[PDB]
Amino acid sequence: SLLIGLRFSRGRRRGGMVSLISVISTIGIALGVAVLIVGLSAMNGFERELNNRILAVVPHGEIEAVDQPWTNWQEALDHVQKVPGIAAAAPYINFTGLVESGANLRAIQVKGVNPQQEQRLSALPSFVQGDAWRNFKAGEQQIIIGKGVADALKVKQGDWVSIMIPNSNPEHKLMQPKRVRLHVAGILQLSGQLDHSFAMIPLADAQQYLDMGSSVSGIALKMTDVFNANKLVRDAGEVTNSYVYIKSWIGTYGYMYRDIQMIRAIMYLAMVLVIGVACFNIVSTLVMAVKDKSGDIAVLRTLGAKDGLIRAIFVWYGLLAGLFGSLCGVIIGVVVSLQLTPIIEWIEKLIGHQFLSSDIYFIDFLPSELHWLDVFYVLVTALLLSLLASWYPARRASNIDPA
Amino acid sequence: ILLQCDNLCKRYQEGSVQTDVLHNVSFSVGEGEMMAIVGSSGSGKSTLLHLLGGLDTPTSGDVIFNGQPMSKLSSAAKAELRNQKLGFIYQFHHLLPDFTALENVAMPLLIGKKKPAEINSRALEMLKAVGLDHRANHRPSELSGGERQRVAIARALVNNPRLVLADEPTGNLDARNADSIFQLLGELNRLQGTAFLVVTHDLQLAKRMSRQLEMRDG
Amino acid sequence: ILLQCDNLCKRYQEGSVQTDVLHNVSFSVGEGEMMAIVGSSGSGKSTLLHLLGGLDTPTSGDVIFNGQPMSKLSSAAKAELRNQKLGFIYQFHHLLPDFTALENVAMPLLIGKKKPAEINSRALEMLKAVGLDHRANHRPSELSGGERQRVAIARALVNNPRLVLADEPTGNLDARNADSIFQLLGELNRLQGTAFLVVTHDLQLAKRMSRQLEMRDG
Amino acid sequence: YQPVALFIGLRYMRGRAADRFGRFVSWLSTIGITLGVMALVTVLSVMNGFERELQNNILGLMPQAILSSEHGSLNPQQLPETAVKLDGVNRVAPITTGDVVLQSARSVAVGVMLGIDPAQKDPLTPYLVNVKQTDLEPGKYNVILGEQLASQLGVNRGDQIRVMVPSASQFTPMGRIPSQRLFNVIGTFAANSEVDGYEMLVNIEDASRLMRYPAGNITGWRLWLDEPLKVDSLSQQKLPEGSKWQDWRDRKGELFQAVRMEKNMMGLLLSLIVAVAAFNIITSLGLMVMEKQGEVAILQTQGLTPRQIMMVFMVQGASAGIIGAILGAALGALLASQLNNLMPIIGVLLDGAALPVAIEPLQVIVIALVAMAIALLSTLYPSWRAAATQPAE
Numbered sequence A: 001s002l003l004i005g006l007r008f009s010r011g012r013r014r015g016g017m018v019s020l021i022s023v024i025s026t027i028g029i030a031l032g033v034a035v036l037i038v039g040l041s042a043m044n045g046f047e048r049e050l051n052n053r054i055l056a057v058v059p060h061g062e063i064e065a066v067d068q069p070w071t072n073w074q075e076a077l078d079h080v081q082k083v084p085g086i087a088a089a090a091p092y093i094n095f096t097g098l099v100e101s102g103a104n105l106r107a108i109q110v111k112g113v114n115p116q117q118e119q120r121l122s123a124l125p126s127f128v129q130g131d132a133w134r135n136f137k138a139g140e141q142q143i144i145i146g147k148g149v150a151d152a153l154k155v156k157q158g159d160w161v162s163i164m165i166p167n168s169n170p171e172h173k174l175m176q177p178k179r180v181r182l183h184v185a186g187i188l189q190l191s192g193q194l195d196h197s198f199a200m201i202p203l204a205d206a207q208q209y210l211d212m213g214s215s216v217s218g219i220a221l222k223m224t225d226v227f228n229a230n231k232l233v234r235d236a237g238e239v240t241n242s243y244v245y246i247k248s249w250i251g252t253y254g255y256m257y258r259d260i261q262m263i264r265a266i267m268y269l270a271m272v273l274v275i276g277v278a279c280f281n282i283v284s285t286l287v288m289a290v291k292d293k294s295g296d297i298a299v300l301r302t303l304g305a306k307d308g309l310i311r312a313i314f315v316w317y318g319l320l321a322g323l324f325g326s327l328c329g330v331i332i333g334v335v336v337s338l339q340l341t342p343i344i345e346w347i348e349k350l351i352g353h354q355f356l357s358s359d360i361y362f363i364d365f366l367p368s369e370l371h372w373l374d375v376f377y378v379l380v381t382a383l384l385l386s387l388l389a390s391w392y393p394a395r396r397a398s399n400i401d402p403a
Numbered sequence B, C: 001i002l003l004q005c006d007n008l009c010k011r012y013q014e015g016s017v018q019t020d021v022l023h024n025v026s027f028s029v030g031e032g033e034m035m036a037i038v039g040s041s042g043s044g045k046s047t048l049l050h051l052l053g054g055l056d057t058p059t060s061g062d063v064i065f066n067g068q069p070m071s072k073l074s075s076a077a078k079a080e081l082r083n084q085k086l087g088f089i090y091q092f093h094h095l096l097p098d099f100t101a102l103e104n105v106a107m108p109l110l111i112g113k114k115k116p117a118e119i120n121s122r123a124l125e126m127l128k129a130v131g132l133d134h135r136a137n138h139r140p141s142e143l144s145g146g147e148r149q150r151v152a153i154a155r156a157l158v159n160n161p162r163l164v165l166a167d168e169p170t171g172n173l174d175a176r177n178a179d180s181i182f183q184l185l186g187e188l189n190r191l192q193g194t195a196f197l198v199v200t201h202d203l204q205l206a207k208r209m210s211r212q213l214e215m216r217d218g
Numbered sequence D: 001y002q003p004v005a006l007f008i009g010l011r012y013m014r015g016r017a018a019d020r021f022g023r024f025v026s027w028l029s030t031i032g033i034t035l036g037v038m039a040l041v042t043v044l045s046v047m048n049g050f051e052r053e054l055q056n057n058i059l060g061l062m063p064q065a066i067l068s069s070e071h072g073s074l075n076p077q078q079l080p081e082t083a084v085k086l087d088g089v090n091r092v093a094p095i096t097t098g099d100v101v102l103q104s105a106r107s108v109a110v111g112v113m114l115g116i117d118p119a120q121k122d123p124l125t126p127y128l129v130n131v132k133q134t135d136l137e138p139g140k141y142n143v144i145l146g147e148q149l150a151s152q153l154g155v156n157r158g159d160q161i162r163v164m165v166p167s168a169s170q171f172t173p174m175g176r177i178p179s180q181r182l183f184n185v186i187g188t189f190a191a192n193s194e195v196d197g198y199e200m201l202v203n204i205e206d207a208s209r210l211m212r213y214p215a216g217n218i219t220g221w222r223l224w225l226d227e228p229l230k231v232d233s234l235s236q237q238k239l240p241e242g243s244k245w246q247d248w249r250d251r252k253g254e255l256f257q258a259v260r261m262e263k264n265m266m267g268l269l270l271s272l273i274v275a276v277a278a279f280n281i282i283t284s285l286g287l288m289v290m291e292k293q294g295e296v297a298i299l300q301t302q303g304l305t306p307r308q309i310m311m312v313f314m315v316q317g318a319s320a321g322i323i324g325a326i327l328g329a330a331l332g333a334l335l336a337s338q339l340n341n342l343m344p345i346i347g348v349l350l351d352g353a354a355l356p357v358a359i360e361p362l363q364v365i366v367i368a369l370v371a372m373a374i375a376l377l378s379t380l381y382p383s384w385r386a387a388a389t390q391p392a393e
């Protein structure tokens, strides 16, 4: 069966517009599957970069109390809070102070954390060649600054900081601005919009500015699960205080996952439509071929083979054409996918216009990884559509012999 | 001792404008007895081959086969009879371009066999039977049209033949080999009985054999 | 005078046999009378009809028209020369089985002056003059096989056909009423027509023209 | 019947009894182009509706292209509003904005303030709650905050907050003497948009005293635009006397460039769809010429020029493209039109919640015209090859 179909394809080399009837279908399948592969690789790269650049540094959840700032280690115990589902926890100080330096200024949400607790809790390294995290202790009261914020203030590794700090008072003495400048400890790079808000101070030293004692706000979670966060974050009562509503990792950055999945579905459907159009092309060439080789189909009928073989012959013909197109497309897609970031950088340099804005996007560069199961899915769907297209000429291949 | 006659006739599908072919057909093929027809098939007589052999359904009357009327069976069943017993050459031009002649002759056996190994062996021994060992493994279009019919007959008889509805056995080749095919066809008769019914219009060999009939309009 | 033939041949690949048709011939067309050249066929004589028309550049050959060469003109210039003055039927059933028989007859009429009142009126009577009025609106596919050719004969004739170079008025005929087309060309000549070059491959019942020639395979 | 040789092409479209009209091979290109245009128009219109939803959200409640003098604040006497009618605007109103930082008793925040006169109406007016802006008279140093800004700062109503203007003084040898004056909150505005958290309403005179501008001059005039997205075109205009034309492209603008790049990316994918359809076009004609290469011989000698027959196959592919483009655009616009009203509720699958749509007629027409051009330019190769020589008659 394979002999007749395969020699039918390679046989038609003279006449029949060889350079306009088959290479065109090959190009159609190639662009279709190649761009779909590139898109899926880009989406998988987005998932990987989101997991290793947002999930590893953002707290997996938050606990808050509308009452006085102290929640744990003064009024309650975080050890009671540890229940099956949470990997670790550490108290965090939500300390918004904002920074102005005259002509230069930006908005930051200063945060107070113990270096050992954050090192054990979540993977948030200094992300700089300086590697000053080991020196970042409750000593000289150094302050971490994000790259975008440091860029705004035009500050560097070692210098003073024009940080503005507020004061609190129970309705006795209000509006008494104060400023303390101690030091700056490196940068904190994520190549995302988070780099313009984060600024970290040792928790013990942070308590020395906000005038209280042994009192820390909530925000103490680190969760081994990364999707069940919305459910088991409801672990209040172990600290009492307020249990009406506590912020979680859902909502603040949960829309990113929804967007990634939705883009995947849209791109998949659109490229399946592309493959369907190319299958229209191949069914057209199939019906033309069966009209051309009607005499041969007649003589094969004269020589035995029943209705089945001719159907099989032309189904194999169409499937072979589609398979060649899909193979060319998938090899192009694989070779271009593993070099996606270099080629995007190349075209960005040539165009001279940054494709992804660091201001609004969290990547600043286009990632890509290949899963080698998406490729199998691509070939499966391409061959299935090719067979579906080939079905009709198969039925219109049982023509009675003209003579 | 087999009828082969059912007073069958064929007409066009409409029958009001287009004409028809000769009426009250009376084949008497019977067993493996050789026949020859020279009744000027150029006027149009190939329609019987479209009926005799189950190529197309006849408008009126049927054909009695070896032991059962093949017209009263499924096309799948009919195709099996055509492959196993009947051998056709006709004038389909028997051209499989881009398909090598060695496999081309073996095609009817290549529709399924107990052991693929010996299918090729039958092809070569028929090529030497017709004398076509030279230039066997190459395209038929490359080969001249003189040997085009030489390989054509082999495909008809490569399978074990019992009915051979041969048309134009001479081809366009020399009279020495044109007459020698009778010796070649006679050799197969020595092996076992096999019918050779020929419909042509060339009168050179019309009287050359026995059991010759003629029917153009009756 | 009208057309002066010269050495015309067919060329193939230089490495293989070129298979030249002829290399020493020189014939002229008299304005008013016609020729008839037929010999042994089989060397492109049927395609040689297309050679006279403005279709392919001759291989080491050339043809001339009235007062000016035909092989030294642009494609646009060739169009007018063979539109309203030159028409000819072909070997097989080339009558464009997509339009209506009325449109096939009026096809070269449509390519020219737009006299729609005249175009439809002339074709019906002119086709009736050939012997087809009833069922003329039928498609060529739903038509008699012999009737396919006679429709083309009317198509080959136009408002002022200066010359026709067709060579197959015979073929699918009836021998009872199909003999009329033989005298139709002569009747136009008897009614102040033009030169009608026509001759069939079979000289029997066809040498009734002005003068009779032979075809050579030089 | 039509001396344009389009009769031949039109009859090829309809075909004979056993032609490709009923075998879904002549109109296969048509349906491919139809689906391509369907995707184009539907997705582009929906995503344009998304973009327009942001137009009303973050630009319908934001200053747009304030007209400020070259030297600094523009004195209203020098360049009165009576002679600033620039084409393309909707109306005009004085306004004063600047970067300020807000510190309450507990927390601190940053925003931009609106020096507006309560006498004129405000696009934020239908979003105030339990507050009427007429209380913003000079002297009281009043201010209205945003719901998100109030939540971030904690204060709700009746509290006192301080505003610090960075662009002031910072030159005295006492370290710094920034312009600081206390203000009291009166209420919040609860527009369901992200403009909150950095937008507050103040009186014009209070704004003038805040920024140390001499006299009661104003920074500039708010300039509404009917189509603010195309503001860059309005940038080049004859501004009366010396002034700047400073826009929202500096504070915002990166987000809108990003959404435009997203629009272009979606357009590129769906244009890949339509380009695959166009590639499908050429083969269908290529078959339609390789077959019927017999009938061209009949016509070729009958008289019509190669240019005459180069068109019949040209119109053969083009007419398929014409029908597909119009049918796709018309039916496609119908899908988008019914995807907001009488929309079959499928909000559980996608994000849902009344998918906004904005069918822009100019966008649809251009796409249909491009589909016409792409389909027609594709047909040239089969038509050009359709008249080469007289092979195998």
Ligand SMILES: *C[C@H](COC(=O)CCCCCCCCCCCCCCC)OC(=O)CCCCCCCCCCCC
Pocket: A035, A038, A039, A042, A043, A259, A262, A263, A266, D042, D043, D046, D047, D262, D265, D266, D268, D269, D272
């Ligand atoms: C939210 C998304 C984000 O925008 C994008 O996804 C842009 C697409 C780019 C993604 C591809 C990543 C790799 C880049 C290069 C890939 C190949 C490039 C090819 C160059 C030739 O935007 C949207 O999805 C908004 C659109 C909303 C429409 C969704 C549904 C509307 C219609 C629903 C029913 C229709 C029948």
